[PDB]
Design a protein around this ligand. Structure first.
Ligand SMILES: [Ca+2]
Ligand SMILES: [Ca+2]
Ligand SMILES: [Ca+2]
Ligand SMILES: [Ca+2]
Ligand SMILES: [Ca+2]
Ligand SMILES: [Ca+2]
Lengths: 164, 181, 181, 164, 164, 164
């Protein structure tokens, strides 16, 4: 077997949220999980054709004063083609969390473990396991710098160099 | 205890909804009427793509689940006409949702296809994929539907024919969500 | 066999659909924002009648069932605001769906009512009818809903308050049908 | 072994019989069983040189009103070179059936199991196992659309592309 | 069972490269491997619904004089969607070969034995195992009649009948 | 484990040698084997800190007419620092080959499987396994398009991320 197991921590997305703009339902983070976003996996997927996600956890680590107001809801939609970004969709899914802006939380979602494709294509269900969505729950009193780390572990295969 | 700057949140049972439900039923996927003389050979009577939306009770249950897998799928062709009607029918289930071929040979090639007279009711026990399929629509139909059902006329019928295609199904829904088409 | 005048029908599995499904979840029945100063005493923050339509995932499952019975029903009041907000709230669940009284006494009288500060989250474990209730709407609300939830302010709040009322429910649907509102 | 076992249902021949033309001995169906007639086996024999029939049943499925008059006799002559189409030849053979026009019957004949040739040739005994013959027994009062399905099962060999 | 193992060789593409036009990077051959491309598999796929490529190899057999100064690079990209006509992209793929214009070579690539579909659809990744690309390396001196052959061994399934 | 075995072929260098310039001792190719030189290993080393070359071979594939009178000598010096462009120095190294300009050959050298560093530094002996040298033997007659390929199999370690 020529499968290469690669794993590690990496920050998929960082967002800045100025004070007073975090209204309810505001989409702070909306990231379709593909290996291109992941820093270390971006180079590994550039040299392979297919990958299979073996572990995926999203650690939301926001950095705001403890007296800041408002909260956030984070979830992982297993369907990359789904284009719904609301509290209802997040609360429906498994692994979703809701917490105050100064709390760091962990999202352990339900993701497909089949063999996906690193490259882009017409069918998004064949390239990504899902979409991470992080929304505001209430108005934030202070500016929030939110960073979403992602502990991943994939199994690459089929060596081939690829272009952006 | 003390009075902190901000107390920790205590939302406990979030993202722990029900994950798997088994749903069963038997619904009419098609109903057709043929006035005398239109049942020419090869005329397509029923062309129904098996999707959760086609099944009414499953249509709502598929709106709260991401992926479903078909466990049981059997079709019934019930022609409600007397035993003095000429001509006949051929019914089949193409496992490929994208296969749009409407001929006698294409139907007869599939496993479980039936050929009968217009006064004989039949049951199609087809070949379908047990793999998990996506409830919501996508770019490729082969990831969302187990197949297609085709019902054709074989001979020129003599009288008006009423034909009902029923489908006994049983699916297993997984990966909870809330689809908003 | 012989050739009769008309052959007998052979529809076998008709009217034998699934009868009972247990459905569970936890959904936000209400969400309110109070700018500073509007939290006057007795001001009604949340007034939600517990019906299957109010619960999103149950709304679709109730459209294919006639009667449902509530097995578990517990509400959570989550105020997402700091620990320096004045005033407080009272939350209760009136078992009578038609009881439209919004006062502190009416809420506190009910079993399981909670009184807390705006920086304390609470859980209401109320008294609800275990009897079978009709999914579809009718002339009398007491045959279709287990009760009503009321959340009121107790004191004048100092800061803007975000309050979310979540409801952990568990129902048993019976008597299959297809409701078309 | 590179033998490919292929089997399936397929309609060899459909015939329309107008009312009043089905006199006694009329040859409704006269089909020399070669893989070209069989729809799915037509494509399989186009890519192979030799085949051996392992199972052969002919299901006659006529579609006429139940009050129609007259009957049909169906048989399978094991000799493709034989050019006799009468009730005598059919009744002599094994597996022959006789039935009213509205009855569907099954013919389980006696066929050679040797290795035949898909392509045509001078000797017809080396290419086909036999000839299906379906005749009218009496005058038919109504128009009859008769279809002869064939449950077959062959064992192909010797890969080679072929032309009509 | 419905599984029918088939194998054989077939010329997927043939190209004629006149003298002087074989500049570096020129795309001599770009052929997406589909069942219709292979003659014997073209008929096999017309009578089945699914196929899985168990074995796949290619042979480049250029037919040029021994005084033809030039070279070619050949490789099987295991992703039908990927489109990159560069030397490094081909050489990255496993089994890719580089040779002179008067030397026949064999490509033994890597690919996933996933159960593909014999009929075309919106997504090419479900109907094709990949695509063979043959490029020029250096300017050729004489006319080259290149003929890429493919030795395949596939496993058909789900009996049906189709029209292209 | 952090160890990730990778392997593949990549063209380390390509040179064009015009007619008459291939005098004896001329240095056609002098390429220091570094991870950046190999495309697929270039991305693999950008996401790791250490690598050890488990297997390393080279193939010389000159592309010249069969009437090209001349010869080449190829060899892998296992010391990056050593700098000697002489025939005897190359032939001394294990696996060195001598051939005609129209004959592809394979170099299977000797080297130490020491855990090298993927990023450049002051000492080249810690970042490169060696250097391949290809010299002329005798004056060539026609233009030669030489392309040295390298088949490598390395073992990465110490996960990290780097920029070149
Ligand atoms: Ca790709
Ligand atoms: Ca969906
Ligand atoms: Ca009702
Ligand atoms: Ca032949
Ligand atoms: Ca198809
Ligand atoms: Ca470094």
């Amino acid at each position: 077997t020529n499968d290469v197991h690669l794993s590690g921590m990496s920050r998929i997305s960082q967002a800045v949220l100025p004070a007073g703009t975090g209204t309810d339902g505001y989409v702070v983070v909306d990231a379709t999980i593909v290996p291109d976003l992941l820093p270390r996996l971006g180079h590994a997927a550039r040299i392979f054709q297919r990958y299979a996600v073996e572990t995926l956890e999203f650690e939301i680590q926001p950095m705001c004063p403890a007296n800041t107001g408002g909260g956030y809801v984070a979830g992982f939609l297993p369907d990359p083609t789904d284009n719904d970004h609301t509290f209802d969709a997040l609360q429906a899914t498994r692994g979703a969390v809701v917490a105050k802006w100064w709390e760091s939380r962990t999202v352990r979602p339900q993701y497909t473990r089949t063999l996906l494709w690193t490259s882009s294509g017409k069918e998004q269900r064949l390239t990504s396991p899902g979409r991470l969505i992080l929304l505001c729950v209430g108005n934030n009193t202070d500016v929030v710098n939110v960073s979403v780390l992602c502990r991943w572990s994939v199994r690459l295969s089929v060596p081939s160099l690829e272009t952006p």
